[PDB]
Ligand SMILES: O=P(O)(O)OC[C@H]1O[C@H](OP(=O)(O)OP(=O)(O)O)[C@H](O)[C@@H]1O
Ligand SMILES: O=P(O)(O)OC[C@H]1O[C@H](OP(=O)(O)OP(=O)(O)O)[C@H](O)[C@@H]1O
Ligand SMILES: [Mg+2]
């Protein structure tokens with residue numbers, strides 16, 4: 001049987017070879033074996049002890065070789081994981097996603113989720129945000145959407161086509177689609193080290209109709225490989241890879257941000273958006289419950305305005321501006337700002353989110 | 364509590380760094396943490412699953428970094444395992460051991476044990492062989508579970524040959540037995556056997572290794588673990604942890620680091636293929652050792668492959684013991700040991716000794 005401990009062992013030995021003898025398609029086939037093996041051991045017997053040993057061995061070996069940081073390997077690992085995912089089937093406005101890899105050791109405000117909601121109230125944009133709950137961070141995108149008043153377990157591959165028509169904003173919670181990421185959930189906790197799984201999230205979008213996306217990465221080293229990976233997983237999707245120089249998987253509200261355009265490169269600074277810089281310690285997460293209240297009451301209610309130099313508001317506005325600019329095919333950042341500001345203060349941003357919470361409520 | 368998953372993880376993280384940050388002393392501490400975690404292993408628990416996940420990860424990462432093939436790491440690994448062994452206590456002739464790492468993928472005749480027994484028939488030599496080999500000495504009429512740290516001191520005074528079965532001393536190696544099976548890849552544990560001798564009085568030893576690459580680092584490791592032991596590391600170019608009966612063998616001489624080469628021609632023997640020197644299993648290997656080799660049925664000149672193979676390995680051990688490289692003289696003493704009946708008397712005395720325990 002190809003779906004065996006013996007087949008996984010043979011893949012691990014190719015990683016122990018000098019130099020490593022494991023191809024990108026080998027990685028794909030190895031991950032399917034792992035996902036098969038882990039789906040079947042629902043116990044604390046010797047078989048699950050043996051399987052956990054070989055899965056740990058393989059993933060650790062992979063991490064040490066650093067082959068899991070090459071575009072073609074990341075691309076193939078995403079493909080293998082998607083084979084245990086529930087994909088959304090639709091019938092054929094710019095549709096965008098905005099999502100970071102996480103793993104930057106920052107506990108910043110949930111700015112991707114927040115920028116997705118504000119973008120979704122601009123005319124001609126539709127936002128289909130895919131995301132998860134927090135691993136290393138204090139507040140995740142998925143933690144925020146739940147405290148925002150939405151029952152995310154009602155949103156699945158069978159219910160997204162119902163929501164699709166009359167929503168400018170949608171949020172898809174990763175673990176209700178990706179049963180494969182669920183199978184490796186326990187062993188990832190036990191390993192306590194980063195593996196190939198830590199960078200796959202942004203590339204598991206289960207809706208093929210997304211046209212453009214901003215993908216945040218935690219390192220400069222990874223960004224160019226992640227740019228190439230996104231080309232392979234999302235062919236003919238126009239996409240930004242962003243890296244904040246402070247070490248942030250988002251457009252940084254302090255110092256500069258590099259953007260990989262798919263390889264084209266350009267730099268961003270808050271001043272290009274006509275905003276003051278703000279320390280990350282002023283843009284912190286206040287936990288998911290208080291984050292819901294900051295987003296809903298301070299930002300979405302229009303309590304603060306452009307020019308108030310309110311850090312979190314500025315931070316959400318800038319990241320919204322970049323999503324707009326991407327959607328229109330220009331780099332007029334101060335125009336993106338104006339369009340983001342109008343989405344808040346018109347009430348469009350908050351209505352877009354409320355229509356989503358209501359549409360999910362009626363399932 | 365230092366002996367925890369959190370401490371082991373902190374060691375794994377140093378191995379993932381660029382470049383690695385795990386010291387040889389760090390490896391010594393990680394091995395004590397692994398040995399602790401494994402023996403206190405709550406069966407059927409999520410905790411068990413997690414421990415095995417972390418131990419597998421650390422050993423795999425250590426293997427991929429190749430730090431487990433560096434002298435100082437091998438030596439610190441052996442010392443960590445030895446903290447869990449029974450050690451033999453002896454008060455106050457050259458005392459030798461001969462043992463390979465295994466892992467050469469060969470299934471040749473048990474020549475280490477055979478040469479140990481023949482060498483123990485030569486005057487001025489005492490042989491305290493340590494190994495895992497262990498089936499052959501068992502089928503020779505020998506109760507190996509009566510040979511332990513408590514009985515070895517009684518056997519010592521009046522035996523020229525002794526055999527110590529590793530798993531009756533090295534309780535540490537027992538704790539990692541199961542994760543080693545599950546792993547199915549080589550780890551640091553694969554090369555520790557020769558460096559866990561429980562008797563500190565052993566003066567000189569031949570340690571065979573499976574690879575040319577490991578050999579030089581294994582020589583330096585032996586020097587760290589066995590300081591003021593005169594030692595030969597040996598590698599058969601065919602890929603053998605023994606002096607090869609076919610082609611060349613390289614020897615790393617650590618004498619308190621020198622390198623020379625051996626060939627059967629230098630012992631006055633013909634070459635033989637490994638196919639012609641195969642193991643017939645432990646039962647028949649004992650019939651062959653006792654009834655054919657030790658009984659004197661074969662002679663220097665018959666070109667009998669297994670006999671030549673044993674004779675050449677005894678001669679290297681004799682020369683090491685004597686502080687010279689007169690290989691042909693070593694063959695003379697080996698041939699004398701067999702045909703005087705001294706080699707067989709040495710084994711018989713050990714077998715009867717163990718029976719009296
Ligand atoms: O490993 P961690 O650092 O905790 O990262 C966790 C989350 O980071 C990403 O946030 P995303 O860009 O979706 O959302 P946000 O900007 O709203 O936080 C992604 O959804 C991960 O689940
Ligand atoms: O390659 P493996 O299957 O792991 O076999 C390895 C064995 O080789 C060694 O034998 P030793 O040199 O002690 O004695 P021998 O020559 O009599 O076999 C050692 O005692 C191991 O148990
Ligand atoms: Mg983000």
Ligand SMILES: [Mg+2]
Nearest residue numbers: 462463475605
């Ligand atoms: Mg041997």
